[model samples]
Target: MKELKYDVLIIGGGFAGSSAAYQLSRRGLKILLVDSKPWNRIGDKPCGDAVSKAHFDKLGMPYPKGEELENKINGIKLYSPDMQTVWTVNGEGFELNAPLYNQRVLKEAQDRGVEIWDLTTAMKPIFEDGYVKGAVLFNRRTNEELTVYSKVVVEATGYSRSFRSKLPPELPITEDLDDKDADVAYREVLLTKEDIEDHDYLRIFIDQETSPGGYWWYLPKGKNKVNVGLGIQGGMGYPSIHEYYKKYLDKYAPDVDKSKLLVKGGALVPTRRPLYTMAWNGIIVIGDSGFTVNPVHGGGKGSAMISGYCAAKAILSAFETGDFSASGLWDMNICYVNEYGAKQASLDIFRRFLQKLSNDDINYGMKKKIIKEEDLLEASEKGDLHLSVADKAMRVISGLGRPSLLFKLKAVAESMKKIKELYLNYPRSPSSLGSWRREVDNVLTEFNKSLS
Candidate 1:
């Protein structure tokens, strides 16, 4: 029965929460960050654990170095179902010790006077007149319940969307609680029996049967270790992720030591684009709670950090204006969707199209070189591949064997562009949300038509 007040409060001390705490605290906000787990136990969620320089650079935050870092990634090689055709995209990224990285970021926030209460769990938001004012928290160590008040409350609890579920029903974040939109993931860190060749390049294999609506990845952590995982869409009649990973290894990397597994875990991944609007009255959802994950690969650590940084800016601005309502926080949505969210949405559209592609179509595209390395690279970079009229004509003339696949890719590219454009032109305020939602619905409806 204790009460505490802060300028801003953050729940779930993962990437998003920790980063937001760090950024906001530096801006002179009285911040409190709470997590259900102990400090050292954070960031245990199963993920690829790879983040690029692009993410840190954009956030203007220093990348983790020394023990916090694991491996330096230079590129990713994608394998077709046939396993004969490969596509490689060069990029700079790091595979980090996820927990240590989280700790480092949280420490930075703590140094700036952000109060972090580990083992303190947020039960639900405290609402008044449909506006969030704070949360009910339980400190397991102290065995006490507390009501904490804040001008703004942030939910960064990843896929669980714990605090978000308690919010009023009118918010868009409350609507898409369907499992069909989630990525069921399982991963393990393994020590290989022998040194892995090309240790700097990550490997990805696509097979609908093995990973229906998802893919398996073998990402090398430099010298002799690798992170192996598979992610498939839920509610898709898919088998267990562990089942798929075992099959993938037996047929692919038979020599890897299963007995030497260092870590094993799973998590439900939010694989859709970010929510259309992440800010509501006195509350905003960031990180996976906001579905900022990439639809193509289910990667989100970078996007979550970006969301945290953008949200911090918005939160601070709202404090300046003394308006903690949804309208005041609206710019956070604008900043996120325009900066990176539009691209994430575009990728989700492409992800939907990709889920419909049969292995034969993928294999055929690879064999025919219709899915060019440049196309993959471009798509990965900006979430769309622009094809010229001549390129389309040449593809149409030569790819008659799988016209459906070709048309789907073409349509996907078009939809990706249109959605990105639409997001860039996102409504300026709450009054226009109805029109924007209708327009967005039309776009998604058009995309859905192809599924049939």
Candidate 2:
């Protein structure tokens, strides 16, 4: 086996891993990034390709332009199951040229002095003295084995958690994801025969019969080019996402030529709250591996970038004190939870409530405006359900016919508020993590039990 050493080793080269590499590169650390994908295909992946502009503004990075920009989005239009009631929630965002945008960010990381090892698969974690020491890598191109040693190891290997899963079972970060907490999605990019109308706004359809426990989307990448897909909640014994994708595409656009397919693929997205702890001694998890994707919409690119940045910050701090233990890296967990993970936890509660509702329930809610466009916007943006006493009274009156639905909504909101509070008071040190995680599990378990 060949041996190598570096200050930091990052596994995977997707949005999260590449962003972490970029953030840590210029800080005088010897950083190396390895991925199973070839150099030219580093940024390619199946996705809906949409990101809110607010994420860019938060990171203080320049907005994507030129080749990276596909279409400018004004907002989103949500359709009820019956297709009669439509609520337009205005929020600025973009439909990206995904591969190009990913490549651009990755190129910036390379320019900043990060080493790259594409087409190399991370086979397993190397543990030493109760800490993750590094990983065993297999170079697909050279057919050789290599062992790498680093002060810090980052796992950004998406939902599979390939590298992180190989760690010792006794570690605090060994939490396993329940299948129901994820979404199995399939999407396609196609060239339409005619221009898409109102292409500036992304469209979402919430139809339980067609997309059980999830939703379908039609997002325009350009006037004639579009990204269409659907996600189905996992572990429900539902048919494959591809089966649903085919039927929905035919129903949605029968006029489009079938020969114009540009890209077609499927992927799994972690659609629940982030892991209880994202850091352990000499190791950190980010992106899908840490379940950083939003539970409601399943949009992960922006949050993945945020996770990368936060992990880099924590790793840098650890180096400052010459400590690479869990406590030294604990700030990554605290920072991410306060900034984005808290909202995700709240949304996970809301997601469970949404899955239990039938098509008719959604139509009624939309028709009566029980949950207005602004309410949804606020929920998606801040993870809060803001209803004053007067507003609550009005909503109660509007939803009087279905008191059960109203009651469920109220319950969901209360649970979300509680989860948000718990996350805000996240454990200040690793020693307190056990108690804090128990509280979170109790809240989520009770909410789910109520749904049944």
Candidate 3:
């Protein structure tokens, strides 16, 4: 068996792993990235293909252009279940050619000296002395096996959680994902026979009967091209995501030509807050493996990239100190929770409340404007609910008939605030993680009880 050594081993080539590799490449560290997919299919994954432009600006990365750019999005339009009330949110974003964009990032990493091993499956993680040492790999194309030893192992294997799942149960890094906290999604890129109006605005429809526990999205890629999809919470006993997609495609976009399908695929998304701890001895988990996705919208690309960036920084710090234990690598969790995970935790509470609402409840709420556009923008951005006494009085007057909905909103808002506070106080060291996790679970359990 061939054996090799590197400073870091990243197992996955999606946005999270690739971005981490890119960040670590020019840092004088020996980095290797392995993907089960062939080189050409490295970044090919089913997704909504939308990312906020703020992610790029925050990371100081170049904006997508050329073949990687699909469309420039100006805002999003959210429609009530009855289709009577529309809330327009102004934001800048992009629809990306996902595969091409991923390839571009991987190429940049390669140019900076990160080794690429495509078509290689990471069979199992190597554990020694209570630490993840590396992984055993199999090269599909060459029919060869090898063992790679690295100081740090990164698990960015999306929802599959390949490497992370293989870790011993004793390790704190392995997180069990509840089915109800995930989404089963399917999407299609199609060419419509007619031009798409409002091509710069993404549209979202909240209909319990249509997408039960989730929402459907229509993103315009260009004049006649569009990316449309729907997702439903898993373990809800709903039919296949494809069944819903087939039943609603024509209704949602009548102009979509059957013969002009560009792309069609489905994926499982972990739509919840991040894990309790992202780091274990000599290992770090990012992306879907760490559940770094927006619980409400099911957006993962931007958050995954941010997780990768955070992991790279922690790995660099660990290397500098020559300590690869969970304590030394703990900065990844701190950085990520501060950056995006706290908002995600808050949103998870809001998502649970949303899933419990009926169509009439949503329609009434939207029509009454009890929750204004700015409320949503604030919630989505900072995970804060700014319902003051005056605002509450006005909302109470507007939400006269639906006192239950108003009460639920107030409860969820309070719960979101509490959850965000807990996440912001995430433990600084692994030793205190258990107590911190217990505190968070208590808040979540209480919030979920209120929803029920």
Candidate 4:
């Protein structure tokens, strides 16, 4: 069997793995990054094709430039089931060709002396003394097998977690991901021959009958092209996303034609929140493998890249200290949870509360102005919705005709605040990890009980 040795071995050359390789290799570490896809298809995946600028600012990644970016976004409009406008949140971000942008990230890694291999699939994890040592890979081209050994092994294989799923159960992250924690998605990119209206703002719709536990999105990709899709919670007693998308035009966008279809794809998104632990032993889970996705909009690209950045930092420190054990790499958990994971966890609680609401509840919140643009803006940006006593009194007075809706609104708002507090005070080390996890669980339990 052929053999390779490196300081870091990354499986799945998507955004997280490639970005991790870029950061590590640039630090003078030997890195090997492999993906099952061909070179040109490295970063290609079905997604909303949008990312927030806040992530870029946090990770120190430059905003995508040149042909990498498709459109700069300024606002997002949300619509209720009755097609009534809920809110239009003014935000800052951009829409980009995800595959092309991923390619750009991969190129940076390659230039930094990271070895890049495509069309190579991981067969299984290689273990030494009960810890992951490396991975066995199979090259599709030559039908050959190779063993790669590294100090660090990173799984960034998106939501399916092809590699991480095979890890030995002795690790801290071996629990199966609950299906209810997942979101099934379907999307299509259409090149319309006719001019698209309202190309400036992203459009979103929430309807239990359509996207239960989730929503539908229309993201403009500039010119006459747009990316449209729907995400629904798995095992939520909803119809398949394909069925929903096929009839979306008839139910909503009747003016748009299906004949202009350019491409279609779908993926499973882990939208619950960030994992409680991101690093253990010599193994680290990044991106979707780590469940570092937004609980609200199902956007994961930014969080995935953030994981890569944190992994690089933790690995570098581990090498410096001559330790590669779970405790040695625990810094990654602290860095991620305190930074990006906190908001994701907080928003996940809010996502649960939203799933509990009826379509009419959402419409009532929108129509009565109880849920306004400013509230949504704050919620989206910080994962918390704060309403002072006076503000709550005003909303309560306005919602007097619908006491039920007012009660639900107040309950959800308070839950959001409480969840945010729990995340903000997240434990700072592995020694405190267990206690902190229990604390978080109790908090969520109470919040869910209030909703019930």
Among the numbered candidates, top lDDT falls to: 3
- Deviating ranges (above 4 Å) for candidate 3: 389-394
Per-residue CA lDDT of model 4 for 105-219, tens digit only, reads 8887788788888999988899889788899999887888999998989988888789878888756665457787789998888876566677777989989878888898888
Evaluated at residue 410, the lDDT of candidate 3 is 67
Worst 10 residues of 1 by lDDT: 388-397
Q: Rate the local accuracy (lDDT) of all candidates.
A: 0.83, 0.87, 0.88, 0.81
Candidate 3, pairs of clashing residues: none
The CA lDDT at 274 in model 3 is 94
Best by TM-score: 3
Give per-residue lDDT, candidate 4, residue 190.
Answer: 80
Global CA lDDT of candidate 3, please?
Answer: 0.88
| lDDT-superior candidate, 1 or 2 | 2
Order the candidates by TM-score, highest first — what do you get? 3, 2, 1, 4
Q: For residues 1-452, what per-residue lDDT tens digits would candidate 1 score against the true structure?
A: 78988988899999998888878876777899999998888988888888887999988876889987889999888899879888888888898888998998998889889999999999977988878999999998899999999989998988888888987887765746467778898888888888998888888999888888888888887688889888888987776878887777766566478888889889998877788788888888899999988888888898899899889989988988988888999989998987779888888788887888888878777677775676666676687667563266356446466455555566666777888888889999978987998898899888889766
**Between prediction 2 and prediction 4, which has the larger lDDT?**
2
What candidate 4 gets wrong by more than 4 Å, as runs, is 387-394, 397-406
| lDDT (Cα, tens digit) per residue for candidate 2, span 223-243 | 998888899899999988888
TM-score against native, each model: 0.96, 0.96, 0.97, 0.94
Cα deviation in Å at residue 330, candidate 3?
A: 0.4
Error of 3 at 6 (Å): 0.3
